[PDB]
Amino acid sequence: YKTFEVVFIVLVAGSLSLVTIIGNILVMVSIKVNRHLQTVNNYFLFSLACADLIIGVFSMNLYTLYTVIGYWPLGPVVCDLWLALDYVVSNARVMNLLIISFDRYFCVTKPLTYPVKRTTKMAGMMIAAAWVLSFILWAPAILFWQFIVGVRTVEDGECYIQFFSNAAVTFGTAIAAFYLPVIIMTVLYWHISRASKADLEDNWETLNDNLKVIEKADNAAQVKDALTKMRAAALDAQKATPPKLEDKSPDSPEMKDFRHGFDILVGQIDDALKLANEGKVKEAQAAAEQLKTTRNAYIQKYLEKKVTRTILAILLAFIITWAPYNVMVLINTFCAPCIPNTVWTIGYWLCYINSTINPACYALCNATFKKTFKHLLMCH
Ligand SMILES: O=C(O[C@H]1CN2CCC1CC2)C(O)(c1ccccc1)c1ccccc1
């Protein structure tokens, strides 16, 4: 069985590495070739995808070589470079999530000052500062500590951070590098979700979303289920007042036009409901296209939930995939035999799995990312 276990580990490991590489490369290229995806959020996500790509290329394969062979066969120099690269990339990831969390925090708490300062240059210099700071914090201590103490205690065939010979040092470093950032991101997101928890955006977003549901419906249930809620949010959006210019009275021509547009909209919605009841569901979908026509005909009267959802998904992926290894670091301070080598391998592999899961958290949930993906994969 042991031979089959080795073959199985090599196969699933190469599969994970390949999926990670392909996904993150698709994200990076998609941002680089589509100017509609060249936003600050996707700059942060670009850096995150770069870190995930480095994890998928270097860390995964070399760790598989390590585990499968049973010792470190490459050498001390390559071991030092691999450790330094992995920890610098990990730290850059952590501070990247910190940058995303704080950026969203200032977006939701300072709308009058921060959005105007939120350009691609500021994001670029923040990302660059994150990478440089990570490299300065991690690289010299990993590469040259052996020269500082004057002896290399990493014996032949081993690969580990030398100054992590002490368990308490490793745990303290895990507090400075993992626990405090996770707490900070948790509090920041707490303020995000409490900030999002105004009405006009919810009604309009509901109406448009249900319109898209009617357009892409498969059976006779989704069309009506989106029709009734879309009409409810339509009337609730008609009763309220949008941000009108000059603050006009309810008897003004602008308000009367605003109500009239939703009158026509509800009328055509009821026509689509009629045609949906007679058995002409296809004509009800075309009638939904008509709803889009009149909606865009009267859309000048109008002008974040999915962004908060996406951020939460990324944060939860990181925390859930990275918590076991760090609690193994916590337990290792008082009982080293309590964590076998296999469990260490499992924690390492969850940390690496974070990079494979990341693209599915923000790219497979965005329409522009999907369209750019299919453009990249189609044969020209
Ligand atoms: O979990 C951690 O690192 C993971 C990333 N790499 C190296 C060690 C593990 C698994 C793979 C991390 O909490 C950690 C690990 C060991 C000791 C101290 C901290 C960490 C490391 C660098 C930057 C941010 C966090």
UniProtKB/Swiss-Prot annotation:
Alphabetical list of CDD domains matching this protein: 7tmA_mAChR_M2
Disulfide pairings: C79-C159, C335-C338
Primary location class: membrane
Transmembrane segments: 6-28, 43-63, 81-102, 123-145, 168-192, 310-332, 341-364
Induction: Up-regulated in response to enterovirus 71 (EV71) infection.
Subcellular location(s) per record: Cell membrane; Postsynaptic cell membrane
Domain of life where this protein originates: Eukaryota
GO cellular component term, pick one: dendrite
Membrane topology: Multi-pass membrane protein
UniProt cross-references to InterPro entries, sorted A to Z: GPCR_Rhodpsn, GPCR_Rhodpsn_7TM, Musac_Ach_M2_rcpt, Musac_Ach_rcpt
Extracellular side: 64-80, 146-167, 333-340
Residue ranges that the UniProt entry lists as topological domain Cytoplasmic: 29-42, 103-122, 365-380
GO MF terms held by the record: arrestin family protein binding; G protein-coupled acetylcholine receptor activity
Presence of keyword Ribosomal protein: no
Keywords attached to this entry: Cell membrane, Disulfide bond, G-protein coupled receptor, Glycoprotein, Membrane, Phosphoprotein, Postsynaptic cell membrane, Receptor, Synapse, Transducer, Transmembrane, Transmembrane helix
Subunit structure as annotated in this protein's UniProt entry: Interacts with ARRB1 and ARRB2. Interacts with RACK1; the interaction regulates CHRM2 internalization.
The family this protein is said to belong to: Belongs to the G-protein coupled receptor 1 family. Muscarinic acetylcholine receptor subfamily. CHRM2 sub-subfamily.
Protein's UniProt name: Muscarinic acetylcholine receptor M2
The organism of origin for this protein: Homo sapiens
